[PDB]
Amino acid sequence: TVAYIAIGSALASPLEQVNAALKALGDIPESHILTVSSFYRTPPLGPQDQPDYLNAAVALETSLAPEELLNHTQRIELQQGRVRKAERWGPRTLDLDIMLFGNEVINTERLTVPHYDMKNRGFMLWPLFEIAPELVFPDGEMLRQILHTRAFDKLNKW
Ligand SMILES: Nc1ncnc2c1ncn2[C@@H]1O[C@H](COP(=O)(O)CP(=O)(O)OP(=O)(O)O)[C@@H](O)[C@H]1O
Ligand SMILES: [Cl-]
Ligand SMILES: [Mg+2]
Ligand SMILES: [Mg+2]
């Protein structure tokens, strides 16, 4: 099954963290990375003190169950998702979200797939479009269609 995973980092200098996360994703059991989008920059839409976010999308082939994949992405967030500076470990700055899991619809306490808000987010749609321009959602909606309708601005590369 092809799973599409969104990567977000809130770090001032996120490349190291994002690379560590990518390596960890590739090490997930019964899985391998198919492709990785470019890294995209998105400024904060509010308090401008916050660093730009780094966004990307990953296609992962997996034989794991969706909730098993979630266990792994959540583990990676716990293991690579925080950075120490000086005398303190920072809070979670890495976000790994399952956007799509094959052509499956999931609605459990732990998992909503397709991701509940991705259709509102250029920062999740554009990297996904780069790696899966012909993508069709489980309900028959098309990624191209959503981008065409909402006219979200393209993202600058990191
Ligand atoms: N598709 C999905 N991918 C990842 N986590 C998901 C998910 N659907 C539901 N969740 C749930 O989301 C819960 C909270 O995850 P968080 O990462 O803290 C939310 P976030 O990603 O910061 O915001 P967002 O969901 O608005 O993008 C998890 O405990 C997990 O069970
Ligand atoms: Cl529902
Ligand atoms: Mg998120
Ligand atoms: Mg999340």
In whole angstroms, what separates CA 57 from the centre of its chain?
5
Question: Of the residues 27, 92, 110, 150, which is catalytic?
Answer: 92
Output the CA–CA distances (angstroms, integers) from residue 123 to 28, 51, 69, in the order listed.
25, 15, 22
Output the CA–CA distances (angstroms, integers) from residue 144 to 6, 121, 149, in the order listed.
18, 14, 9
Pairwise CA distance, residues 5 & 28, whole Å = 13
Amino acid at site 31 = S
Output the DSSP codes for 69-99.
Answer: HHHHHHHHHHHHS--EETTEE----EEEEEE
Pairwise CA distance, residues 1 & 135, whole Å = 14
In Å, what resolution does this model reach?
1.3
**Angle, helix 66-80 to helix 15-26, in steps of 10 degrees:** 140
Pairwise CA distance, residues 106 & 6, whole Å = 17
- Ligand closest to 111 (CA) is 1
Q: Where are the domains of the chain?
A: 1-158
CATH 3.40.250.10 fits 1-158, yes or no: no
- Residue among 63, 67, 64 at smallest CA distance from 112: 67
Pairwise CA distance, residues 91 & 94, whole Å = 9
Question: Of the residues 41, 52, 75, 82, which is catalytic?
Answer: 82
The answer to whether 56 and 37 are in contact (CB under 8 A) is yes
The answer to whether 98 and 28 are in contact (CB under 8 A) is no
The answer, yes or no, to whether any atom of ligand 1 lies below 6 A from the CB of 110, is yes
User: Per the omega criterion (within 30 degrees of 0), is the bond before 114 cis?
Assistant: yes
Q: For the chain, first and last CA: distance in Å?
A: 29
Ligand 2 is a single-atom ion; what residues have CB below 5 A from it?
A: 107
- Residue among 32, 13, 43, 41 at smallest CA distance from 158: 41
- Residue among 72, 73, 82 at smallest CA distance from 17: 82
- Residue among 99, 129, 132, 135 at smallest CA distance from 114: 99
The answer to whether 145 and 52 are in contact (CB under 8 A) is no
Q: Which atom of ligand 1 is nearest to the CA of 110?
A: 31
Catalytic residue list contains 153: no
* Helix and strand totals (H; E) in the chain: 4, 10
The answer, yes or no, to whether any atom of ligand 1 lies below 6 A from the CB of 111, is yes
Residue 55's H or E segment, with its range, is strand 53-62
